[PDB]
Amino acid sequence: GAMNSSNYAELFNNDIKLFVDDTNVYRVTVHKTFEGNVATKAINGCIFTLNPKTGHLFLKIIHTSVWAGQKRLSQLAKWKTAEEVSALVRSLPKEEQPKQIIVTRKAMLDPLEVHMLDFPNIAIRPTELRLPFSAAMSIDKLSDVVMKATEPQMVLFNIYDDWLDRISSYTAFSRLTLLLRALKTNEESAKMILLSDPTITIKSYHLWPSFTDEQWITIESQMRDLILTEYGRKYNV
């Protein structure tokens, strides 16, 4: 069934499962036409497909050309996401295919399910959680490869860098979602926190700085403080 705070820990068992987030697939800017009407201009987007146990990210770049000449694009983006997720599954050896796919938005259920009809033993599942994966595009290297793309492209990352050499997948995912939550609620402050110290650098094959264990404790504490601050501001509490 649906995924919530009760069955959180299923994510980190040894059943292969992928999260799919489609929030960044169809991205537009809104602007005024010469005659004063409103028009959209599309920019490149991405499917965020993530194995939360291993950190492997399958970042499918969606090139604006895909929208060329199509109507009801917001609806089409959902079907394109499912087509691409299905092709990713098919491209994987059987022993690597997920036993479940969890979509971050319920609207993705029907399109994926239809696309995955060839895989009846793969469960398609919604979630009640409020996962902050829309902020993936606040990760500079992810935003950069998406915006530079000239053609449809699949880029692979480990979104946990090397964290798992030292911490469990439960912990890595809690760090990831804390960081993304912060980046979603106040990107500028979140980025300031991560980059204030110029002597802690980002490895060329990494996405995040190379904090020691002790520096991560401070960072995670600063991110929590940021989140609670922004929450009091939103609700005047």
């Binding site: 089409l76 079907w79 499912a82 087509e83 029907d110 399109p111 399910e113 239809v114 696309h115 009809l117």
Partner: protein, 300 residues
Amino acid sequence: MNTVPFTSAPIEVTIGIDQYSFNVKENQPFHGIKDIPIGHVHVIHFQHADNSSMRYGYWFDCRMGNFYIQYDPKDGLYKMMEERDGAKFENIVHNFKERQMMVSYPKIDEDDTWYNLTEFVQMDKIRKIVRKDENQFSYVDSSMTTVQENELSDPAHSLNYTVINFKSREAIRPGHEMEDFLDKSYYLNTVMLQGIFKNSSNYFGELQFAFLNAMFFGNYGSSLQWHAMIELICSSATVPKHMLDKLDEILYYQIKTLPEQYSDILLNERVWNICLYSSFQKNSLHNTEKIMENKYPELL
């Protein structure tokens, strides 16, 4: 006109014949229903005064034999049986009419209701859905499950409605996933009409039969099938204009005949809002829309 005599009425029961019904008292002298119109299918059904659970009954056609009712005290239900001795049968029928113990099929002459509800229903197709080839009539009741329901238990006693499933390989051509799921036209027209039903009159006959079983027996899987067969048409952009006009009539008379107090469980909110207001066919069910709005505006 034809006659369906009754050997006896041992137990208090409400007897139905098509959309009509009467109350019969324990061991009241009752010996059948006469003046039943030849030319259509009919259904005679039962609800014992002591068990308002289980409505049951028999679909039949007077043209296919001489049928009568007899209460079975071991099995505890009114059973339909076929009399092969044409003479013995006319003799029982005549003697019972002479004694005036039969009720008359109470057709108002103006009324085409039953015809409108059963236009496309054929006894031969019913016997394919209710498989029991030793009898010319077919038994249905409240609890019988459908084939599709069994996939999600006893096959002999099942309703073999044609299986419709919107998220299935059969409904979705590889490569037209989005197109075929939003526009079910290829599923209706090629897979279901041309492929399985062969023509719309059989599709319609099965749709109508499924409604009547839902209505007379509260058969839940029958109501599900009826709604699926409506949804498939309403969710197809491309339907023969003659099917649209005949579907509007069919639904109109189904909605009209339905007991007012059963509209909650017999009518699926989602399907009907989709058919009438969102689907491709929103503007093509004028009579069905109008009656649904004036009689059940709450559901919408």
